[PDB]
Amino acid sequence: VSPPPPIADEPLTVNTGIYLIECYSLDDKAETFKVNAFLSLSWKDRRLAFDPVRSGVRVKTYEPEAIWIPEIRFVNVENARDADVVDISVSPDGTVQYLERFSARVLSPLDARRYPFDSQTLHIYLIVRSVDTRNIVLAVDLEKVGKNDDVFLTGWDIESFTAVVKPANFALEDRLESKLDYQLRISRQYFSYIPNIILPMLFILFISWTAFWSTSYEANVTLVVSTLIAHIAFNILVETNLPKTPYMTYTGAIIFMIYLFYFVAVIEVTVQHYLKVESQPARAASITRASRIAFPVVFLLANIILAFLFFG
Amino acid sequence: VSPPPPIADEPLTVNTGIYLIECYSLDDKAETFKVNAFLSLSWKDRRLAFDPVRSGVRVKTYEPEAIWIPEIRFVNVENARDADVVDISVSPDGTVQYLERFSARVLSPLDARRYPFDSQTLHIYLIVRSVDTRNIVLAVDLEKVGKNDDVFLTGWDIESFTAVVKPANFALEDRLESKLDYQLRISRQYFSYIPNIILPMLFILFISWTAFWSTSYEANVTLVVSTLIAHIAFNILVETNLPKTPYMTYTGAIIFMIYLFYFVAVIEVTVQHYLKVESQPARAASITRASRIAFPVVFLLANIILAFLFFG
Amino acid sequence: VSPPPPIADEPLTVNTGIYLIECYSLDDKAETFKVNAFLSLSWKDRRLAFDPVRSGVRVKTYEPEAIWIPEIRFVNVENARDADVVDISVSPDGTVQYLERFSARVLSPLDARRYPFDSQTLHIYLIVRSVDTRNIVLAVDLEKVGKNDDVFLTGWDIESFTAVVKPANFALEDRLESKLDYQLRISRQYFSYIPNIILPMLFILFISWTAFWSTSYEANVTLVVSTLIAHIAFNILVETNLPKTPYMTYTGAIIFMIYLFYFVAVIEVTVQHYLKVESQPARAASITRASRIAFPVVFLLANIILAFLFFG
Amino acid sequence: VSPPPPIADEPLTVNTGIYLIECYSLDDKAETFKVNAFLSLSWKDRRLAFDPVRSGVRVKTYEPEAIWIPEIRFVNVENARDADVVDISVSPDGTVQYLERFSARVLSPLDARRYPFDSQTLHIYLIVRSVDTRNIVLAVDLEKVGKNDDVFLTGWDIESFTAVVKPANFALEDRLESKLDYQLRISRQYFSYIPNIILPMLFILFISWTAFWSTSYEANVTLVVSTLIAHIAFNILVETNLPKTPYMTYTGAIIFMIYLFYFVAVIEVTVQHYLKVESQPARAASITRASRIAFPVVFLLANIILAFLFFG
Amino acid sequence: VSPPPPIADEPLTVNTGIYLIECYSLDDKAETFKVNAFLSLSWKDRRLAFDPVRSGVRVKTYEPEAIWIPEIRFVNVENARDADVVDISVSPDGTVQYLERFSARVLSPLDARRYPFDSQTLHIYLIVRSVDTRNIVLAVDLEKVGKNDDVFLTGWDIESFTAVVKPANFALEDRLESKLDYQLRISRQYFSYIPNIILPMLFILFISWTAFWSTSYEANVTLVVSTLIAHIAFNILVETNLPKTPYMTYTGAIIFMIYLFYFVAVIEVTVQHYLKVESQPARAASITRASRIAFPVVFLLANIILAFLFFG
Ligand SMILES: [Cl-]
Ligand SMILES: [Cl-]
Ligand SMILES: [Cl-]
Ligand SMILES: [Cl-]
Ligand SMILES: [Cl-]
């Protein structure tokens, strides 16, 4: 009911540990994900010391009330966690073991500049606030940190779940606070992205490029404009997978380049027809023959430059 | 209020049983489903023994409090179950019967590689944690496991609801735990998928294939490109039924093959026109006559190979 | 606090009644709807008998606690009902009157084979579980069953709200249970469906049919394929009203027939052009003249047959 | 804890008042809106009379419990209101003043026949149920009814918030009930509807009408069918603003008329081409010259008639 | 449990302060956003005075109950805040320090007339209600107002978070109330808007403008109408980013201007063809040569005028 007084001036150390159980509902647009895990705490309080021989037992059990419990809170959460106590055990020396299961929704920013091949690090921050009588710090128990083998995120590969052992101590509202950081590393599964997104767009663009082997104005106009319409329709079809961010990504740059290429192809067709009308067929033939080689080479070079820029 | 002490060293056995009442909200993308069922527990505690003759009654009733109840928890759930106690009865020998009704949301992965003709097995995991004084194990009561005849899932056929009798015992956080597995088998109803998805796409492709009986460049270009646009529009229309997974499925492979066939048809039309312009009509006629037979046969062979690959 | 003991062996009868207040959120895809109504119960318990002359009052009032209340539960509900007690009154003879207001979400399957002109019957099931001391049955009070005149469902006409007087008694988990069924009959308002769905589709099909009065291959190809694209676009526009079921309905069959007709029209145009190219104009003229009559008559006959099949 | 007994037979009068604070989430399809306001009640109970001189105070304060409070409920609400008591004050004469803040979701039907220029009246119904000892009626306190100046609804203009002073008394379940009606009048802001919905559709139709100045069958077919496709696409684009009701509205009638006009234009183009093929150019020229004037005049006349029908 | 009586007539002053922690879920259409912050209160109550020497402690701690706490409420919130007390400390002089953490959903109107380059000011209103015994006012503690460095809003730049020091006092329901205003200033990140929205639309319009260099009626009709279809499709693709408001914005005006330009281009093409048919080629050549210059210059001038109108 009251914090344990220090011996002379020493602070109170609380050892923490989080065991991951389930993770779900990773929202890329809202930058949120849900968690469900165990929380373990351990501190020392000599007011609970007892003689095992006299009592006849080795470990005693206590109610969540009638016992002082440090106030641990999460920083980057939408609401307070929904938790229920599992076990509270005390040792003859006075060491208290605390265990509980909780659920929470976490806010963590994401960076999707390299959307198909990005890696992210989700953060969970644990903080404690000191009281007027005693100062409290936080520590990491490396044997209580882990994850279940059934943890899965759709479309992601879970790599590791560690914690930074060194806490961060700072003052807030004229009170000392200590903060710990838990990190979960994930990587995106980029397969099925090629045959579902990349290849059909390239097929439509290559179909549009066939206008360089024809001299009929009507057929070329139909081909190019209808392929533009088909490209827009495919973009509408696949927009649900593309990231929706206020900054430019790799795929968005590729799509913008495709739009620019469509515009340039329209210009080339118009120029060829106008030159043909003016009774100068040699210039038009030279221009279309040059374009036949120029377009794919420029496309490849621009793609290589963009890939080096984004991943270099 | 305290676990029942053992006679000498024997563990405490709890017999479990789940009677399914309702199932709803099966989300394929989120891999979740909701449940509503009865939970039955039965253990032995000799501290509650009584004489039926002296008491004048055969079965006694107790409040949920003032009685020790084992702590049973679900593993693959988003939040803790919402449950309410129904009946607690004790026998003169000391056997306690526990019954309750609960609702929960379960997380279970799904495999939709053969989307139209897939079968799934949903899992519900039941776990218990031992205490410092006594060790607790779990058992299955085969007469308390079943489902109501009104249980239904839209678009699925419910086949069976059984449980694995052998529990899994392991250590976690220096404590013994026992786990049971309940399995529900379902199969998808694949009718109305043909006339709503498969046939219109084949009709559009067959319409596109009519360009092999004509020698007009403008008409062929219009036919092929407009059929491509129609195919993309139909894909947009029916995307709500197709599975959205990070891996390739049967229908996705079929759709990709259709895209490739459209591209090849465009190439064939362009080649025929270019050969005709060069004053070589015999080669163009031979090529289009060959394509007339080549396209459907190759389509059929590729479909057969794909079907053998996915279902073999 | 305890069930009322019987005189010798008679069971306890509970008279029930539901007065509908509001209904809302009818989901066709999820087969759910929300309700808000009054629940009325009435049984007999002689332990509460009193003398009106001695007490000076005719009707006494009791708290929800300190009084035995039968446990009534709904079967086809997602969660337990959210209810609050309104009045508890006792008669000198010992008859107890119970009233409460509750809200719940009900699961009831729907059949939409005749989507525009279907009628449905929503079911609410009420059950009670017997105790070890006394057996309880259910009865219907016909004067406590009704609905408010302000009850409305968007797009539906409410016809009646009755209850089956005969309960169903069966054993479950070695315990007797009694079940009552409440039925609400509704019919769909099919107006505004014609001018918003049926007529534009027929207009597009009739526009496509104009190709039988022309001999230009390019114009016919453009007409038919562009009308196919327009049909797909209109289907995308109006898909939000069409039912999404795993079985075939009337409108879906009509749409599939329209797709088949488009395919056949494409085939006819191709055949006419090919015959014209082969320098056989008489056969092509005969074929197109025959098609001019054949197409609408076959459409009408097929529609009549389909209507007889679905509504016969 | 008990209702105040009457002097001889008079009923108990409760004066009510609602002060609007916020309104939000007006759903046209679901016919629902959310509210947040103050509730004020005032009745007379002589059991609380006290002498201000002896007590030394003028106004006393009471807890929500240990005091009889009339049970006020809302009729057209999805669930029970979420309310918290603010102040309870009593006068030496015995008059009690009650104040609370609540939030609720209201169900109120809407009529959108004249969608762009419609006005609605939202209703909130307040009811009370009499007890066996005393009968209770409701009254309106005109000085406690009002709204905050910051109340706003997106796309609507708030006009007034009054209440019908006369209550409605009727019997339900053999008990007397009194009902009050609170009305909120709103009107829709119809600007930005013209340049975002009306004008582009008219532009597309006028573009389609240019086919009457040309004699080329291919160009006319392309123009009309492509404009039909564009009209359907624009309808898909703007469907999110159009009302979704089971009855016909003004805008829906306009759209249906536009569809009919497209069909008639197709028929005219076909007739002109067929007459031209039959070597009768004078008839075709006369028909197209007549159509040039006939189409816009008929469109204007039909629009005027429709406007008079809907708003007359 | 009772408000502190004044010395003679002075009011009670409460010093407030809000420290922002997290902000998320900014809905432009619903004009709502979620918050999570600390609330700090400080007042004076001499009934809690104590001697530090006699007590042996400097700061005492109290439970949230058994102590009078002023009732602070938010005005523009959907529901009551979800808060939990953190610390309650008292000074020997009697000054009480109050701290709590809360979460809430705020309603604040937004103005998006200059959608790409708009700035907004979100408001949070704090109010208190006086009691019959004592009058309470509000004050701002400038050292308790701030925000965390990790506060982020997707697509926005956070600039400042201040408060108006002067409260607003007014009477409501015959009671005095004091209101404080907290303001958060944000600005929108307008990058990636150009290459994702503006440039493709201009490319499509420029493609449509190429019809002024050709004299073929069929090609011009195809170009213009197909570009109109592509523009509508792109609008459908990008509608998710455009604001949905009942008033006109900058981007909406630009889009309407583009529609008008498409209509005028159609008219020009029709006029040119009709003049050519009438055997007057010089007039048609002059008109198209004039249009070649007229269209882009008028577009630029109109854009400049619109930009000056909206941002001037
Ligand atoms: Cl927390
Ligand atoms: Cl659980
Ligand atoms: Cl229930
Ligand atoms: Cl209520
Ligand atoms: Cl609040």
Side-chain angles (χ1 to χ4, degrees), chain A residues 209-221 223 268-277 280-289 292, chain B residues 217-218 221 270 273-274 276-278:
Chain A
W209 280 351
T210 58
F212 304 139
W213 275 266
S214 165
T215 45
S216 172
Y217 187 46
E218 256 275 280
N220 300 354
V221 155
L223 273 160
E268 197 275 325
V269 160
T270 302
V271 163
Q272 186 216 1
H273 175 252
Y274 193 87
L275 273 191
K276 197 141 147 274
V277 164
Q280 307 181 351
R283 277 175 89 183
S286 277
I287 283 180
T288 184
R289 269 193 263 110
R292 274 184 213 161
Chain B
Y217 188 46
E218 256 275 280
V221 155
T270 302
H273 175 252
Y274 193 87
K276 197 141 147 274
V277 164
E278 256 182 290

Side-chain angles (χ1 to χ4, degrees), chain B residues 84 101, chain C residues 72-75 77 79-82 100 102-104 125-126:
Chain B
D84 51 282
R101 197 172 153 166
Chain C
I72 306 301
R73 279 190 308 267
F74 289 80
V75 196
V77 283
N79 306 289
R81 77 187 178 257
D82 176 10
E100 75 160 11
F102 67 94
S103 169
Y125 293 107
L126 215 58

Side-chain angles (χ1 to χ4, degrees), chain A residues 101, chain B residues 72-75 77 79-82 104:
Chain A
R101 197 172 153 166
Chain B
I72 306 301
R73 279 190 308 267
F74 289 80
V75 196
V77 283
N79 306 289
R81 77 187 178 257
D82 176 10

Side-chain angles (χ1 to χ4, degrees), chain A residues 72-75 77 79-82 100 102-104 126, chain E residues 84 101:
Chain A
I72 306 301
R73 279 190 308 267
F74 289 80
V75 196
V77 283
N79 306 289
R81 77 187 178 257
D82 176 10
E100 75 160 11
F102 67 94
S103 169
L126 215 58
Chain E
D84 51 282
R101 197 172 153 166

